[model samples]
Target chain A: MQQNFGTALGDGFVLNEATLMIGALGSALDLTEEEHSVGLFKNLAIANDKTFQDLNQGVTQDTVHSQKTGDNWTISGNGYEYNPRTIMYALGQAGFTADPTAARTRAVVSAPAAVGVSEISVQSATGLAVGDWVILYNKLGDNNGLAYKIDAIATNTITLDRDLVAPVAVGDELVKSTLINTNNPNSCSGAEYFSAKIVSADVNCNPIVVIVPKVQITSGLNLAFGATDYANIAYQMKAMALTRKDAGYDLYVQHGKSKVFLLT
Target chain B: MQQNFGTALGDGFVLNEATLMIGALGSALDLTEEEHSVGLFKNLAIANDKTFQDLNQGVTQDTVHSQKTGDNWTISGNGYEYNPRTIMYALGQAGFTADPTAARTRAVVSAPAAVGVSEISVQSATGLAVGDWVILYNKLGDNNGLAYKIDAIATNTITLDRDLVAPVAVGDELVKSTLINTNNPNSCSGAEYFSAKIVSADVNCNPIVVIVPKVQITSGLNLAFGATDYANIAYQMKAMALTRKDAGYDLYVQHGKSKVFLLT
Candidate 1:
């Protein structure tokens, strides 16, 4: 091994070549060009660092990245899911009763339509009711869940009212309904509200329903709580600086559709 | 190998039930823990470096190294054959004679002694005169050519003087010598000197001296030159900073010996 300069040269050591020769004999000798180049580069890096203190001070911007370094695309969509606690949290914030049966696979809408129409129609024979506020789930058929409302009803046929939220697809079953009560505190006197009764299930297991307790459109009222829930989740995520936009809301709405609705 | 903060965070992108379930399935069934951990760490390292200006800065002492780090050492020495040019350079800088006949083996000294001693002493058949010097050769044989000199004689046995400037060692032969005219500028006069003479091999294969001209030396003059040569070589070595010494001058003489003899 080589000694450093001894104290003589203000602290340098002497080297003994003879000893080195004896010890180094017969070792495997393999030196690649890449190894040599890398070694030289490493040394050069160190030397440059020492020379400018740029390396010493940790200045590695020699390889500049793009200006979009911090710009990352936020990935989101419908097939996403949340934990039970998250579901409860979202529904609770929406002022919806999230019973354990809320796990039924369907979308749940938050409010009723502007005018109460006749003949509310549903894909399922039994699932929701008139005056029932719906929330969509990641329903069985569609890629993402979408929300709708029941307006009127008849034998084997009911008229559905579509909200700003899109229409649900074939496999998108009506999961739960908030039944309307004409005598409730906020109900209009003498106005009719619709209710739903389950009839049968399809071959693919979609639930069918009939509207009951019909709703009448006099002094129309709209629910504010669902929008508030969506806003709360969005605000919290944004406040936390979370890059994701589809977290707690993915099941309530379809993935890409939720983004579209929220963004629009 | 170690657990860290980044690993504890789950796949946080999806918002709803379906996406979270899919992610959980992927984690549980498709990916091994090792693969997951590796991916997590890699993504974090890239993201961290991307987001943090300090991390993007080059590595520094303050920057965290991998779990392991190390130092390196170099090997060096003389003897065991080195490049003749390199040896010559060292030899020349040390003022040592680089004679081809000087065995390639590195020279070593055992004691504080004068030069011109031989492995075997070959006495002259005839007594040497006042102006005589002993010429030493590489070997104790008649035909051996001159290698060094001892410049004095009295009676049959010559008093071998130390050739501090042109040292010789044991086993070297006294080739031949001659007496010069007193008036000759090269004559030894009151000082001792010897004429140089080549040796002739005879029937007995012994040195048959052919007398040659001689030079002069004052009385008490050292009859050998090897010691002087050693001193000169050592002095030059110090001058060139070739030899290892406490203060660069300590190598001029024997360690802890007469300081005056050490200096040129």
Candidate 2:
């Protein structure tokens, strides 16, 4: 049996669907939540942006060399899943602490929290403790989708770091989200850096896996909500350098009984 | 009956194997040693970087002309092995004068390397002279695995060039490595320029060759440390001008015809 298909025009594969995973660059992937995927994407495209320049002979005016001068390697796509994990990642936030089973608490706002306000007076603060994450609901509030961290709790007042982009009106519902997201976009370059893997299969059931050592969310975070907008968030992530004792970003494809790299 | 592949939709090869060789431009490739390969590459991607510019006429609304304004040929891949030669090439350093038979020396630090201090006392600095590399092992030193160059030897003290980002604690094992790394990130552009060839084969065992007269290492160099992140190098190399009597970046492909014995 031959090991690989030793030809130039290799076998063609159908159904180019892909699943993705993103985790801390050096982290032993630990989340069952992220195992679901990078979200239901309408399209996933890995591409390079390049600009070419000419090398001409000064005397003859003929093109002596054609060289590519600039290139940007990126993985981009439009995602329709209103997924918290991918959203957290797309916003360049640090890895979210997933509490899958943590009971979410709901409360009503007693006093309105205006734009730029740092405190929200809730109807009752029972079961609500400091350092908890809360997300306001309803499209009326500009801060509806944005999450706020509980910096301190005083009686019925929930003090937060000045993160209110809009008002939290009286009777507006809020939930103490189990997921905790760390605001880290401004902390460092590629602070939310993660390794990504896209897995797919061919018609022959051969496995095709593309692994990227490190990718940082370079573009997107628009979470638009409307009747025509399928809650889609378009994103573009750039590939970064690999820095491990054994670094590899691989595209692995397999054939039965023997790997494609099998000796002829 | 057709004896061989003739149609445009030719007989496909099941697998594609590519072997790469790199050496100083204008110098003939001389390496029975580097034949071990570019070290288990994760991926090898050869592509052209191109950008099209449109020439528009102010009078007309329709587009007038489109021209390819830029192009750069590139062969990029990620290396899993951290062998010094490929690493040297990836880091764009002068070719390492490898003396494979030299015996390495070892020592124990009697004193530590504190911040702002450039000297570390070793139990014995025998056989270790100025300009030799010293590597601290086992993680006690924040500078572990980072090779430090010896500037001068004073009795038992090894003088470094104040490049310590972290402390080297006492009792850490250090090796007097013959492998000396020069700090020349960019002494001059393309100083580490090398000619490259990619050898592949088709289904009929015909050869496909891409020859670049010169390719310079142009990717990032970030050797990050962590258990999760692998030590891999991603090389994005640019093909430079082929300055030969008959200059051409050739893609020489061959398909065997009458070479096969005709005793069917």
Which regions of candidate 2 are displaced past 4 Å?
Answer: A1-55, A58-264, B1-14, B28-37, B48-72, B94-105, B110-123, B137-149, B154-170, B176-192, B202-209, B222-231, B244-264
Q: Name the lDDT value of residue B240 in candidate 2.
A: 51
Q: How far off is residue B209 in model 1, in Å? A: 99
> Interface RMSD, candidate 2?
16.3
Question: For residues B16-119, what per-residue lDDT tens digits would candidate 2 score against the true structure?
Answer: 65666666554323433243235455567778656776777677756788776556676787665433455466555543343222344768888767766777
Worst 10 residues of 2 chain A by lDDT: A255-264
lDDT of each: 0.24, 0.55
- In model 2 chain B, which range of ten residues has the least summed lDDT? B255-264
Model 1 spans with C-alpha error above 4 angstroms: A1-97, A103-124, A133-145, A163-264, B1-264
Writing each residue's lDDT as its tens digit, candidate 1 over B192-215 gives: 221111112212211111111211
Clashes of each: 93, 17
Q: Which TM-score value belongs to model 1? A: 0.16
Task: Give the worst 10-residue stretch by lDDT in candidate 1 chain A.
Answer: A37-46
